[PDB]
Design an enzyme around this catalytic site. Structure first.
Site, short mmCIF file in Angstrom:
data_model
loop_
_atom_site.label_atom_id
_atom_site.label_comp_id
_atom_site.label_asym_id
_atom_site.label_seq_id
_atom_site.Cartn_x
_atom_site.Cartn_y
_atom_site.Cartn_z
N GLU A 93 0.82 -1.17 -0.36
CA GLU A 93 -0.19 -0.37 -0.37
C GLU A 93 0.87 1.55 0.00
OE1 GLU A 93 -0.59 -2.89 1.21
OE2 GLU A 93 -3.10 -2.95 1.32
CL LIG Z 1 -6.19 -2.14 3.34
#
Ligand SMILES: [Cl-]
Ligand SMILES: *P(=O)(O)OCC(C)(C)[C@@H](O)C(=O)NCCC(=O)NCCS
Ligand SMILES: *P(=O)(O)OCC(C)(C)[C@@H](O)C(=O)NCCC(=O)NCCS
Ligand SMILES: *P(=O)(O)OCC(C)(C)[C@@H](O)C(=O)NCCC(=O)NCCS
Ligand SMILES: *P(=O)(O)OCC(C)(C)[C@@H](O)C(=O)NCCC(=O)NCCS
Ligand SMILES: *P(=O)(O)OCC(C)(C)[C@@H](O)C(=O)NCCC(=O)NCCS
Ligand SMILES: *P(=O)(O)OCC(C)(C)[C@@H](O)C(=O)NCCC(=O)NCCS
Ligand SMILES: [Cl-]
Ligand SMILES: [Cl-]
Ligand SMILES: [Cl-]
Ligand SMILES: [Cl-]
Ligand SMILES: [Cl-]
Ligand code: NA
Ligand code: NA
Ligand code: NA
Lengths: 238, 78, 238, 238, 78, 236, 236, 78, 236, 78, 78, 78
Positions: A125
């Site tokens: 991420e």
């Molecule tokens: Cl997440």
């Protein structure tokens, strides 16, 4: 003809992620199909175990790179991970390929994680300008806070052995599927009533506050909303 | 269409890996089942002989499961 | 001509503890100089990383053995450790010598701890009749509560390998300084905005209560206020 | 002529579980005898350490298989484990045999756990349809939540080495009794005042909520209240 | 002559890897130097913007050192 | 083409310098390495011979692209790396495959980086690595050297370190070299020479082993082999 | 009685099949295993000999219930398991005790499951396991083989794996076998034969060692021994 | 003849161990198969209810494989 | 002065008893240890010879403060510790340096405490530890013994345990001794004697190695050495 | 005053440790840089020769960095 | 009654385990003290000789401490 | 004669280390016995108060066993 193939066994229901050509991404249909499998399992009073397994080289690749949020509302992903921690069934993740981004949370939210030789876990991420806010509480309740936050900051990849060493996997071996029969035979010594009371007591002793699912949902939506550039970068490296 | 191709490959894979065809998950990666690059090249030469094709050993990378390979092979078959 | 020497690099500011002849003790000037370095780093919108490094055999020896507390007030040490956990910059501690007493907290409060061959960590506080109340939350968020409390009760010393095994160090090698280039290159794949949102979310998921910095400040001041005898003992053993 | 034999030493009181023929089970008299030993230790202002040790092959076998609960009330077991975490004395468990079911909590609630070659730890509770609700917070504060809950779900057994690796034991060796002299000599470098302030601060930084002892007491009583069948099964396997 | 390109590439790699240009072995693999797939994409996008090229991220697998990448970009650019 | 020599303070470095061909073993490489070791030995102030490489392949082994008492030049070179008065140091930052494992293993000290891999592929081609095994087994023990051959086991830096094939491991083999060179500067060439001579006195290889090992490799190569080599080729 | 043979694809399996007697070594077992290895070797398409067992005892060693130059059949069989052109694979899912350790140790590869235990009990009976030690020491090194004998050390699967007595460990030795058989199908019998012949060329046992080892076991057994064997009996 | 009993016992053991009857080596120890002391008590209570017996849980220590247990139950039952 | 003897139940203990001099090797120590081993061997009820020390130095090696076929007394003593009918047990609770490593290594069993350190310093002085290496290499393997010599590697108790130089490690070597003595009481002297004789039959040292090792140490000592010894002195 | 002494020592330290003078942090401990007691004695003999002093090898313990040693040496110099 | 039996056994146990009788906890398990099955059989033969009994080696399992064994033995004594 | 001092010191060391005087090897290092630098300072302050001395904590490094410390204190005290 769905992204989840459902198989019944003795006191278990197995939900198989069944889109290997697409790398078993998370989208709407995967989250509903999984929520519906969990519903069919919980409605069978003789069911004691929910088994989550997959297909091909990707356990689950996370959100597909190939949303409004009302007050108190949670994204379906959060709802599903919570269900896997609160279900009266024992939830077992069988990981023999890549768990990436949201795929790490989906495995981590199960009671027991089995990792085989080809298991890999990585939160990518931060490389896309995102905080994995919805998966982190399910990783951190396994790894502790330092290792979950640092693994996020550095986009650390864990193989089966490393996953096992930090708590993300409970059992490791040549193949996650071959660790499952002994886990099922062991679970057959207890019952759903005990399993339910044990998971409930985990929520009692180690609670998530009632706002956490909303706030985590909001943080992911805000950051996704330069993100286009960083996701192109991530796909080009993929 | 592919189900017979899938069974012919499943029996050969079972023999190469010293297991029974019924032990093989058609959707498991060749890396999860334990097929190395060496038996991979023998397995592709088997595909080529049985189906008169000329596939490169790389095809196990493009279609990295029994299910995926058996669809690719059946679609190249008469 | 100060206890902190400041160096600028590409998207980083490095604060170097620069009193090796005094073993890099904590006093007023060290805490202000560090707080001022952090201010200069955070004011540069192109800065993404704060690097904390040192000189000689002592990373940081803790409070110098060579205070009133208003309501809601915190000692500057607490304020600085909190800043290192809340700064929008990634905070990296580079440890190639002794971190002792308060020095352990200063390293532990950074996002990432790099430990070299000569790294040592030890809370000596109980040997002086003190509780290391201000450092403990920054150690415990890395080690877990049992290992942080037991290491305090036994004044356990950790070398680089042991520090790494318990979570106090994230990376270990022959020299902490040589682990830094790869950490900086990895951090260059994300940005300050993501790093900031990630640290904020750590405080959201694993909070310290608003009274903790005061109560911890009070407990250290109360115990320091036979302490003279036990500190003489500690210096004689030093 | 009791289930606890009491021995005085230099700044310590040793409580010895002294029913080896019965495997040192937990009943009323064991919990009162232990609470009374702790009282005699705490009343001696020169006492700094409470040592908990045992006899034979069973450190402590848990509740004997050979209760009303008023509002806000806690079972005596909970009261004793809390006392071991809150006592101004350092509490040291010396484990050279089987700690089973409730025996695991009794060891885990001590500040320091010493495990010898014959040490074994196992929560058998789920095999009897029980949640070990009263022991779990004392195990989880050592192992973390994931390993404590999974070890409960799977009735995982830990030998000395495995106990040490997960945090349940702080020290491991050929014999727990031979690890005690060095722990006592180390504790003689600090005092009861410091030890007391350190344990108090652990409760401050890592609290159990005021309802937890009641709720945990209630959950164990509810599940004990098919339990007859599962306990017969457990004894037959024993 | 690849030497001008190798220089421009060595300086970008040093900045990317937080080292001095002088520390880089031109014949070391990008893996040995610690260029991950993410910094690899940024490095190829540096090569593209600097020389008016559009080489795939994949090019660092084909020519996996500074020297090999420099010959590729040299013989390509003009 | 195949080796680039760099002198340093009391050392000579032989760099395998054909990365795009994966640093194969041929007559050119073996002769250029023998001539580098000659130059290093002729300099009486030289004390260390460093063997390092380029790109992703330390050394891929025999490029796939014997009178009585005679030994193949590969044997002769491996023995020289064990018998030289110079300390011999292998810097492994990529794949050492087949004969490439023996070239590393024969040096006094093996430094292994994160990208170091070792694997004897010989049995997959119907061969015995007869010439490389003594230099591997003197490090790993006979059981791990023969079972790694039968199974064509791959070692990364940590595994190579654990079984004795690597003396030192870390993120980069090249960054392990300066402390090794610093350490060796405490001793001298005469002392290193006598130590290595005494290793041969205590752990000897009989006089016929070079010929016998060379012969066994030649026999099996002159056999079904062209196919197995194609297969090994197609597998990559 | 004592051995049950099962053929498979390119393999023959000899199963020790007397679990209620704990799979002891006697003339019957040694002869039935020699005859299984003969059958496996006579089949030119056979490549692997698998030794596995039954119940809780892999092999308990000599049932407690020499011309000049001659060797005891136990020696002869252990040497055959090291010299056969077949890859020899031991599947250990219970206690290997005394001579039972040598029978495993002599196979090319030892697979050890969760219930695998190895222990040389010989010195507790006043004996030297002279015939089993060379096959143990070629795996563990001389120091660990002789100190494990002096101390009658017990190894579980992990310990056996760590010291080289087991090449592979896991929850069940039998589930480690299919990947080993899959791997060995990449090579052939001629290549395995030459590899094992070269191990004997590089790690030789002198021609008198079989007689000498056999003699030392016979001497000490023919000694105070009947008592020590009773004691070992009463201890279980 | 123990074969009918071995079959009935093999099917219960497979259900208990979450395998197929075909995967069970009748001569493997219960320890090797992963039958713990808890599933051992349930398995002996299966033998007792099915054959009208009351053998102690201890019987699996005395006859610690399917084959040995089958001969015991065979020669006992009628 | 240099050795203090203590008898126990079936054992004789030789204590290195010159801690303020760091328990150096000289003619006095070697002769007093040979005479302790003679006394232990003459008592037919003796079964164990225990070598232990005093203070911070197990043994510092040669105090820094050869006819044909003859061996130096150090060689002769190390061989006796490997050949004695007595089990020989080294109790290491401080620094074993240079020849002090060989004295420990030559005992059947090495117990290592928290303060145990082992280091061959010889190459830093321009020497080969030729006499100590066979007793080290029979424990560690040739690669780790020769690389530890070249690098003058220091082992603590755990490292010594991991490489086989120590058989057992723990907080105090002396507290590992009673379970070892308890274990050895299960066997007898005749059985220990035959085991050690068979180790020499299976892992032999050729008859010339003692002379050759002794000669190599004498040559290098009689060389630039006085300086290197001063330097080693000034470093401490 | 000390900066020239610091540079003469920095070049000698660089040669003893097989690095470039520019790689050495003057404030790093001799233990962090990897100088053992042996090269320590050679380094002190270097200090003594170059500056005509008679320092004991222990001085690297009293002034355990290049900066600290170079100040001590410059203050003992003419 | 048992205290003399306990002392005779405590001295013999001390000699078998190379410790002083005062080092032995009468309530410690034989497994914790480090008595193996071998010295266990010798210890039982000692009990039998000294007290003219004929106990099986298994008795150390039934009464697995010095205290427990000494009560069992004293109650079988005249 | 150091024997009276060795006794007084042995009893204090045993109390400090939670052992009996009889368990202490007079020639063992303080490190081997587990006397840390903190209990070392307390032990030297015991020696000072008992014999009217003021020896530095450092004395246990100079004479690092009970026997060596006893000779030092013996030849010093009167
Ligand atoms: Cl997440
Ligand atoms: P084959 O199994 O003998 O050889 C195949 C190979 C050596 C080329 C192969 O090991 C390889 O280089 N693979 C790259 C694949 C990879 O990413 N490694 C797996 C870990 S994620
Ligand atoms: P990047 O360091 O984030 O890595 C992304 C990746 C796709 C290269 C990697 O995570 C992966 O899964 N494969 C590793 C092996 C590789 O480089 N790819 C094989 C292509 S030939
Ligand atoms: P079950 O797997 O819960 O195990 C219970 C047990 C009593 C068998 C076990 O926990 C135990 O303590 N003993 C293990 C050895 C054993 O099987 N018993 C020895 C009887 S001969
Ligand atoms: P040199 O490097 O060959 O020898 C120096 C030494 C053996 C005297 C040295 O290792 C030593 O004894 N140092 C005591 C220093 C110390 O405290 N150890 C470092 C770990 S904190
Ligand atoms: P003795 O000490 O030579 O032999 C006794 C034994 C080999 C029969 C013994 O090791 C055994 O089989 N014990 C079963 C006991 C047990 O449960 N193991 C201890 C771990 S809980
Ligand atoms: P004490 O056990 O708290 O130790 C304090 C210490 C200063 C002795 C120690 O922590 C330290 O840093 N040095 C360890 C080596 C030593 O004893 N000092 C060397 C003086 S020669
Ligand atoms: Cl603090
Ligand atoms: Cl409970
Ligand atoms: Cl070869
Ligand atoms: Cl034998
Ligand atoms: Cl020597
Ligand atoms: Na496994
Ligand atoms: Na490192
Ligand atoms: Na210990």
């Amino acid at each position: 003809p769905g992204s989840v193939r459902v198989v019944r066994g003795r006191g278990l229901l197995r939900a198989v992620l069944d889109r290997p050509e697409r790398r078993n991404p998370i989208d709407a249909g995967l989250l509903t199909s999984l929520a519906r499998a969990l519903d069919q399992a919980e409605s069978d009073q003789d069911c004691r175990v929910f088994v989550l397994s997959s297909t091909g080289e990707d356990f689950c690749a996370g959100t597909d790179l190939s949303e409004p949020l009302p007050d108190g509302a949670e994204l379906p992903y959060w709802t599903l991970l919570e269900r896997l921690t609160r279900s009266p069934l024992a939830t077992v993740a069988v990981v023999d390929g890549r768990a990436t981004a949201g795929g790490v949370g989906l495995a981590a939210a199960c009671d027991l994680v089995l990792a085989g030789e080809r298991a890999r876990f990585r939160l990518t991420e931060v490389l896309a300008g995102l905080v994995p806010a919805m998966a982190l509480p399910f990783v951190a309740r396994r790894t502790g806070e330092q290792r979950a936050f640092a693994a996020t900051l550095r986009a650390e990849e864990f193989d089966a052995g490393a996953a096992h060493r930090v708590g993300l996997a409970d059992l490791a071996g040549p193949r996650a599927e071959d660790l499952l029969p002994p886990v099922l035979a062991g679970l057959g010594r207890t019952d759903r009533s005990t399993t339910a009371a044990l998971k409930e007591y985990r929520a009692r002793l180690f609670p998530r506050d009632a706002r956490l699912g909303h706030d985590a949902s909001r943080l992911l939506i805000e950051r996704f909303a330069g993100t286009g550039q960083l996701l192109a970068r991530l796909r080009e490296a993929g | 269409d592919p189900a017979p191709v899938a069974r012919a490959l499943r029996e050969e894979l079972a023999r190469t890996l010293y297991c029974e065809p019924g032990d093989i998950d058609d959707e498991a990666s060749f890396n999860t089942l334990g097929l190395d690059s060496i038996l991979g090249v023998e397995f592709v030469a088997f595909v080529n002989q049985t189906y008169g094709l000329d596939e490169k050993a790389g095809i196990l990378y493009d279609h990295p499961s029994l299910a995926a390979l058996s669809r690719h092979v059946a679609g190249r078959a008469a």
